[PDB]
Amino acid sequence: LVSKLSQLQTELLAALLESXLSKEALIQALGEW
Amino acid sequence: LVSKLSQLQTELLAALLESXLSKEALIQALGEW
């Protein structure tokens, strides 16, 4: 159903968070808005 | 220098944003805090 890209995006983000991704990094990514 | 993991994390996050990653998704990831 969900696009390949969309699916890849969601899976990749969960994988990062599971791996230890810092809040600082996410705050940095959100800042581009 | 930077750990393999750390390096992978940063590269992966930029790749996601470049690909189109939504703000909603990042807001969802930040929310776990």
Curated annotation (Swiss-Prot), chains A, B:
| Record's comment on post-translational modification | Ubiquitinated in s SPOP-dependent manner; leading to prteasomal degradation.
Please give the superkingdom of this protein's source.
Eukaryota
**Where are the residues of the annotated region Dimerization?**
1-31
Where in the body, by tissue, does this protein show up?
Liver.
Tell me where in or outside the cell this protein is found.
Answer: Nucleus
Q: Domain HNF-p1, which positions?
A: 1-32
Role description: Transcriptional activator that regulates the tissue specific expression of multiple genes, especially in pancreatic islet cells and in liver. Binds to the inverted palindrome 5'-GTTAATNATTAAC-3'. Activates the transcription of CYP1A2, CYP2E1 and CYP3A11.
Q: How does it assemble?
A: Binds DNA as a dimer. Heterotetramer with PCBD1; formed by a dimer of dimers. Interacts with PCBD1. Interacts with BHLHE41. Interacts with NR5A2. Interacts with SPOP; this interaction promotes ubiquitination and degradation of HNF1A.
Give the UniProt family note.
Belongs to the HNF1 homeobox family.
**What disease has this protein been linked to?**
Hepatic adenomas familial: Rare benign liver tumors of presumable epithelial origin that develop in an otherwise normal liver. Hepatic adenomas may be single or multiple. They consist of sheets of well-differentiated hepatocytes that contain fat and glycogen and can produce bile. Bile ducts or portal areas are absent. Kupffer cells, if present, are reduced in number and are non-functional. Conditions associated with adenomas are insulin-dependent diabetes mellitus and glycogen storage diseases (types 1 and 3). Maturity-onset diabetes of the young 3: A form of diabetes that is characterized by an autosomal dominant mode of inheritance, onset in childhood or early adulthood (usually before 25 years of age), a primary defect in insulin secretion and frequent insulin-independence at the beginning of the disease.
Protein name as catalogued: Hepatocyte nuclear factor 1-alpha
Name the species this protein comes from. Homo sapiens
Instruction: Name the lineage.
Output: Eukaryota, Metazoa, Chordata, Craniata, Vertebrata
Q: What gene is this protein translated from?
A: HNF1A
